[PDB]
Amino acid sequence: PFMWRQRAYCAPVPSAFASQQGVRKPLLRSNSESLSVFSQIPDGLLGHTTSVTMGNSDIFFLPKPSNLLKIALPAFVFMPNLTIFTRAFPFYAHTSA
Amino acid sequence: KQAWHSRMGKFNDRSDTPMLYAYMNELPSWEYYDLHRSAFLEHMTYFLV
Amino acid sequence: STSPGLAFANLTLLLDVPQLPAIWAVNAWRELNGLFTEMKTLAGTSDLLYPSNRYNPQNEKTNRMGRPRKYNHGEWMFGNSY
Amino acid sequence: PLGVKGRSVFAGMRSFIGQRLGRLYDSFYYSQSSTKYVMVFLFPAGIFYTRFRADTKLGYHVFINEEKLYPDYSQNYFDTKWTNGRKVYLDDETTVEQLKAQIYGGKAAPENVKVACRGRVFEDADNVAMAVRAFCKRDPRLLLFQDNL
Numbered sequence: 001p002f003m004w005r006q007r008a009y010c011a012p013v014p015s016a017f018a019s020q021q022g023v024r025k026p027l028l029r030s031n032s033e034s035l036s037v038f039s040q041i042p043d044g045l046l047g048h049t050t051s052v053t054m055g056n057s058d059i060f061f062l063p064k065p066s067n068l069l070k071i072a073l074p075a076f077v078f079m080p081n082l083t084i085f086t087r088a089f090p091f092y093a094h095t096s097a
Numbered sequence: 098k099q100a101w102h103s104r105m106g107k108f109n110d111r112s113d114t115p116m117l118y119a120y121m122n123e124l125p126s127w128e129y130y131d132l133h134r135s136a137f138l139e140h141m142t143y144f145l146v
Numbered sequence: 147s148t149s150p151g152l153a154f155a156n157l158t159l160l161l162d163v164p165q166l167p168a169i170w171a172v173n174a175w176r177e178l179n180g181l182f183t184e185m186k187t188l189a190g191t192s193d194l195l196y197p198s199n200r201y202n203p204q205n206e207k208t209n210r211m212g213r214p215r216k217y218n219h220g221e222w223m224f225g226n227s228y
Numbered sequence: 229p230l231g232v233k234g235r236s237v238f239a240g241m242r243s244f245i246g247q248r249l250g251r252l253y254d255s256f257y258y259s260q261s262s263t264k265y266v267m268v269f270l271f272p273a274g275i276f277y278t279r280f281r282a283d284t285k286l287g288y289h290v291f292i293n294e295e296k297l298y299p300d301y302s303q304n305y306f307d308t309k310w311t312n313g314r315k316v317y318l319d320d321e322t323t324v325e326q327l328k329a330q331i332y333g334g335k336a337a338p339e340n341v342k343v344a345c346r347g348r349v350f351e352d353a354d355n356v357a358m359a360v361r362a363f364c365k366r367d368p369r370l371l372l373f374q375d376n377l
């Protein structure tokens with residue numbers, strides 16, 4: 001409230017200087033209302049737009065012809081075996097075989 | 098059988114590449130007597146007598 | 147047993163399975179705090195309590211944000227001002 | 229032959245728990261003193277304390293504007309000097325005065341010292357939790373400055 005001619009964002013809209021226009025619309029409005037989203041537009045369907053859901057579309061199907069193959073294939077180890085040497089696991093986990 | 102023995106040896110044995118031999122301050126019977134042959138003799142003559 | 151490729155899982159396990167007791171303890175503490183809050187609410191309060199909120203400082207002399215209540219010096223015909 | 233007549237599955241559960249606990253005691257007894265006490269009590273206890281404190285209490289990163297406002301930590305050990313960005317865990321009932329006293333070690337603080345968060349000055353008779361909820365939601369970085377003006 002100190003530099004009016006230099007702070008235009010906090011100033012009234014040009015429709016307010018015009019002296020001419022159930023319930024009527026307000027006569028005085030600021031340009032600082034531009035910094036709000038739901039100032040003029042309504043808040044309808046505000047919290048219900050993240051609730052319109054659509055399911056995924058991926059199908060997990062692939063035929064598995066093993067008759068074509070006669071050799072084994074390698075396979076990853078995903079986790080360490082804790083069913084054996086459980087007590088020593090923190091003590092040998094840092095070593096490499 | 099040979100794989101079994103080699104695996105167990107590599108895991109349990111005291112070596113230059115030790116897996117399980119680590120953080121050793123109180124040793125078990127076998128390793129203690131294998132490292133300290135003086136004590137195996139003394140502990141054994143006492144047992145027989 | 148183990149291998150270099152399992153360093154991810156080894157680290158994750160070593161650092162996380164000891165935390166599971168603490169996680170369960172946190173869950174139990176939360177249930178007990180909820181139980182006590184609901185028992186207090188059943189007993190009765192001057193101003194309401196928000197159940198799923200962190201802190202509820204509101205009383206006869208205190209707002210729901212920890213400040214003193216405005217216009218609370220006198221008494222009112224309709225009772226509490228809230 | 230699964231199960232026996234006259235015996236209950238709950239009795240069998242009690243049996244099993246007894247077996248497990250006895251085996252645990254045997255294995256703890258026949259173990260190294262150097263490692264077992266640490267690995268069974270001190271690391272679990274520290275992890276429990278840390279995780280419980282983090283998951284339950286709520287903390288704040290504290291900063292100070294000027295070096296002249298830093299506290300005197302020469303005497304107390306393990307921290308001879310103030311460093312900005314310290315994580316500080318507080319209770320929900322804590323006020324700004326209590327926080328200030330905690331920072332300055334129950335000693336005479338400077339004059340007109342105030343707390344701010346995202347440029348917004350806190351009153352001293354204010355709950356830190358609610359003040360942060362209002363002014364800096366999910367950015368609890370507090371700053372201590374001198375308000376002379």
Ligand SMILES: CCCCCCCCCCCCCCCCCC(=O)OC[C@H](COP(=O)([O-])OCC(O)COP(=O)([O-])OC[C@@H](COC(=O)CCCCCCCCCCCCCCCCC)OC(=O)CCCCCCCCCCCCCCCCC)OC(=O)CCCCCCCCCCCCCCCCC
Nearest residue numbers: 082083086087167170171241244248251252255268269272
């Ligand atoms: C507050 C302070 C905190 C610090 C701790 C304080 C103390 C608290 C209590 C103890 C906590 C530490 C527990 C560590 C145990 C694990 C590692 C260990 O240290 O063991 C060393 C210790 C010594 O090891 P050792 O001397 O080298 O070898 C001797 C054998 O263990 C000797 O065994 P045995 O020959 O006499 O018998 C064989 C044994 C085998 O034990 C072993 O040696 C290996 C155990 C394998 C562990 C890893 C298994 C993980 C597998 C992944 C799970 C996948 C599930 C998939 C599910 C999919 C289904 C949809 O069989 C068992 O009893 C194991 C049962 C548990 C395995 C369950 C696996 C699933 C099968 C389900 C079966 C059905 C239920 C049971 C039915 C029985 C009737 C009720 O182990 C034992 O003494 C016995 C095994 C321990 C079994 C668990 C005991 C109960 C623990 C309760 C934990 C609850 C904690 C939460 C507390 C609450 C906080 C809020």
Ligand SMILES: CCCCCCCCCCCCCCCCCC(=O)OC[C@H](COP(=O)([O-])OCC[N+](C)(C)C)OC(=O)CCCCCCCCCCCCCCCCC
Nearest residue numbers: 229230231232233235236237238239240241242243244245
């Ligand atoms: C809930 C999710 C579970 C999903 C993951 C687990 C896999 C799902 C399948 C169920 C798991 C349980 C399988 C139990 C198999 C053991 C059966 C058995 O006979 O064991 C021998 C015991 C001991 O029997 P006994 O020794 O007393 O007498 C019989 C003796 N023999 C065997 C020689 C004939 O049998 C029982 O008495 C019943 C035990 C099974 C019931 C307990 C289930 C265990 C699961 C909970 C674990 C925690 C225990 C503490 C619970 C405290 C409750 C307050």
Ligand SMILES: CCCCCCCCCCCCCCCCCC(=O)OC[C@H](COP(=O)([O-])OCC[N+](C)(C)C)OC(=O)CCCCCCCCCCCCCCCCC
Nearest residue numbers: 086087088091117120252253255256259260263264267268
């Ligand atoms: C999706 C989940 C998948 C993962 C599965 C998650 C569940 C299973 C995960 C378990 C993996 C990790 C298990 C490691 C356990 C390590 C604990 C351990 O062994 O401790 C080290 C100690 C160290 O023993 P050590 O040092 O002599 O030998 C250890 C190994 N070496 C030789 C290589 C060093 O082990 C023990 O001997 C004690 C273990 C049994 C006790 C367990 C703790 C409970 C104790 C309760 C009784 C207290 C009695 C107090 C009485 C006081 C008076 C005397």
Ligand SMILES: CCCCCCCCCCCCO[C@@H]1O[C@H](CO)[C@@H](O[C@H]2O[C@H](CO)[C@@H](O)[C@H](O)[C@H]2O)[C@H](O)[C@H]1O
Nearest residue numbers: 170173174175176177178179180181183197198199200
């Ligand atoms: C011995 C006591 C009981 C032991 C059993 C412990 C298992 C509890 C784990 C269930 C998962 C809890 O995860 C979450 O925690 C609490 C309830 O616990 C709830 O949390 C919510 O309601 C509770 C009411 O109790 C409030 O205190 C809390 O402020 C709010 O965030 C969540 O709705 C729930 O999703």
Ligand SMILES: CCCCCCCCCCCCO[C@@H]1O[C@H](CO)[C@@H](O[C@H]2O[C@H](CO)[C@@H](O)[C@H](O)[C@H]2O)[C@H](O)[C@H]1O
Nearest residue numbers: 170171172174175200201280281284285318319320321
């Ligand atoms: C065998 C049964 C074991 C079941 C596990 C039960 C949980 C065990 C741990 C209980 C520890 C209780 O210790 C207590 O915890 C709460 C939450 O941190 C702390 O309380 C703190 O946070 C809560 C939540 O805002 C408020 O009370 C307040 O902000 C503050 O005092 C208490 O200062 C402390 O005294």
